[PDB]
Amino acid sequence: AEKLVPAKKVKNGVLYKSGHIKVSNVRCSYPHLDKPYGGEDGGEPKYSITLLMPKDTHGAIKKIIDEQIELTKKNHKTGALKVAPSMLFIKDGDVDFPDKPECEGMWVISARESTRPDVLNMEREELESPNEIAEEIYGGCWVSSVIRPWSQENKYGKRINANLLSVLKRKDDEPFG
DNA sequence: TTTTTTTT
Ligand code: NA
């Protein structure tokens, strides 16, 4: 549920007082919302999505994400955390994925969660069956998503990752396949 | 309220 209290609203996004961030009107790729992904090779399976944020239209919400990344580093429970820019949930499509046409001119956000996120159709109805979830949110559609940064400091390294809380269908478009 | 991701 969006039972959150806005702190700051910008074009294509909202920062909430709880530290959650809504990233609005972004293109979806590689959804794993019907069934969790990963944990073939040691890790535990998680639901996930990639969000493609156009650089020309989403600069304000990008700035909020950066600010919140810094805040998350500073507030890490064991003390302020140093994290490399390659170890964040946000990547630069033009640098990191130059051979992927769908990433051209995009910020690329990866968000994951062990608990299945809320999945809403355009009528804001919450979906429950894996098949209906897979049909609704297909790679290439546009969504709005609630995420929240978190700080990782463990045996595998130091990262700022993003919890995936909700995915709302916004627009249909050509599927990536 | 919690915790490795990764392009896949
Ligand atoms: Na459910």
A9 C-beta neighbours (distance < 10 Å), count = 12
DSSP collapsed to 3 states, chain A:
CCCCCEEEEECCEEEECCCCEEEEEEEEEEEEEEEEECCCCCCCCEEEEEEEEECCCCHHHHHHHHHHHHHHHHCCCCCCCCCCHHHECEEEHHHHCCCCHHHCCEEEEEEEECCCCEEECCCCCECCCHHHHHHHCCECEEEEEEEEEEEEEECCEEEEEEEEEEEEEEECCCCCC
CA–CA distance, A101 with A94 (Å, rounded to integer): 9
A153 nearest nucleotide via C1' and CA: B4
Is the distance from CB of A82 to CB of A36 less than 8 angstroms? Answer: no
Closest alpha carbon to C1' of B3, residue: A152
CA–CA distance, A94 with A92 (Å, rounded to integer): 6
Quick one: CA dihedral A52, A168, A46, A21, positive or negative? Answer: positive
Q: Quick one: residue A70, left, alpha or beta (phi over 0 = left, psi -120 to 50 = alpha)? A: alpha
| Distance from the alpha carbon of residue A1 to the mean position of ligand 1, in angstroms | 12
Closest alpha carbon to C1' of B4, residue: A156
Quick one: CA dihedral A80, A81, A85, A89, positive or negative? Answer: negative
Is the distance from CB of A11 to CB of A61 less than 8 angstroms? Answer: yes
User: Which token pair is A36?
Assistant: 């969790």
Residues 6+ apart with CB under 8 A from A41: none
**CA atom of A10 to C1′ atom of B8, Å:** 32
**Residue A170 amino acid letter:** R
Q: Which residue, A130, A133, A105, A109, is CA-closest to A24?
A: A109
CA–CA distance, A101 with A167 (Å, rounded to integer): 23
Q: Which residues touch strand B (CB under 7 A)?
A: A 29-30, 32, 37-39, 41-44, 46, 48, 50, 89, 91, 97, 100, 103, 108, 110, 112-115, 148, 150, 152, 154, 156-157, 159, 161, 163, 165
Q: Which residue, A164, A162, A169, is CA-closest to A117?
A: A164
Q: Which residue, A162, A163, A164, A129, is CA-closest to A143?
A: A164
Is the distance from CB of A58 to CB of A64 less than 8 angstroms? Answer: no
The answer to whether A11 is a known ligand-binding residue is: yes
